[PDB]
Symmetry: C6
Subunit: 61 residues, 6 copies
RNA sequence: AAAA
């Protein structure tokens, strides 16, 4: 399972992820927790509850 | 369930939540009610029944 | 079920519901019928048969 | 099942239907057939096979 | 059903079909294979694996 | 019969240079490292991208 | 990221 091992790894290491949204929007932060439908991203120190259906890509480097 | 937990909590505390839509529209309001498919958001007094498929992000 | 209770109500009382679409379009009319997949809105001299997947929000003002 | 009955009506009577698409685009024609996932719309003398997921509204 | 019948005929006849995408883009080509979820389309000299969820319409010419 | 999983495994095994087109018109060239039912991991321009399939229109080779 |  690539999705979970990936999110798990982002979460455990607290890596700075860039999240790209379907509509073109992007946001950088840290994944704090996630389940099947949502991802909780801490960005600019503030919490965001994001639906996976709204997400295109997670990017890191 | 992370989703239900957060919605449960926004509702209990009648907190003013910002809801972003897929299309980039954004609406500010309080969660009154929600189910497996919809969110009820009171904004400027008026109720809005929103489908979850149309929602991008909740923030505060 | 929130959705199903709200639509039953819109329908029973013949309220002038405004429907917003995912792509931001906006339609205003009376809900005459609905099932798991579609809503039927008698708008301005036309019957509109709408898919729920295309709906963003119902409101009334 | 409002959907299937509506479509059966459109097909049986060859009623002029305007199909509106998610992206706002629109097309008028006669429904020649349909199944669970698609609608066969004849428009300007050409067959169109449309996915229901692409459709926002049917208007008559 | 309607779908499988149409795609099978596109495939067996090597019909040049136009694929319209949800975002308006369009591609012209021949259908090499398809399954429940994807359509393989030869177009502009290249191979394409298209998701049905992104397809809006097929038409011939 | 399962075109999608056959193609992805080929892309991964042969390290084919794949262009991923997204529903929102944007596109990304690279190589597939991992995929599963819901996501694809695409190495491109030095970056790891984790892309949701629901956000993908087409793979082009 | 405000449904013009
Ligand atoms: Zn969802
Ligand atoms: Zn409002
Ligand atoms: Zn839905
Ligand atoms: Zn924010
Ligand atoms: Zn109208
Ligand atoms: Zn639908
Ligand atoms: Zn046409
Ligand atoms: Zn579909
Ligand atoms: Zn799909
Ligand atoms: Zn990149
Ligand atoms: Zn998905
Ligand atoms: Zn191409």
């Amino acid at each position: 399972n690539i999705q979970d091992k990936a999110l798990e790894n982002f979460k455990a290491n607290q890596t700075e992820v860039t999240v790209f949204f379907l509509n073109g929007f992007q946001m950088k932060g840290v994944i704090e927790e996630y389940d099947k439908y949502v991802v909780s991203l801490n960005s600019q120190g503030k919490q965001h509850l994001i639906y996976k259906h709204a997400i295109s890509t997670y990017t890191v480097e």
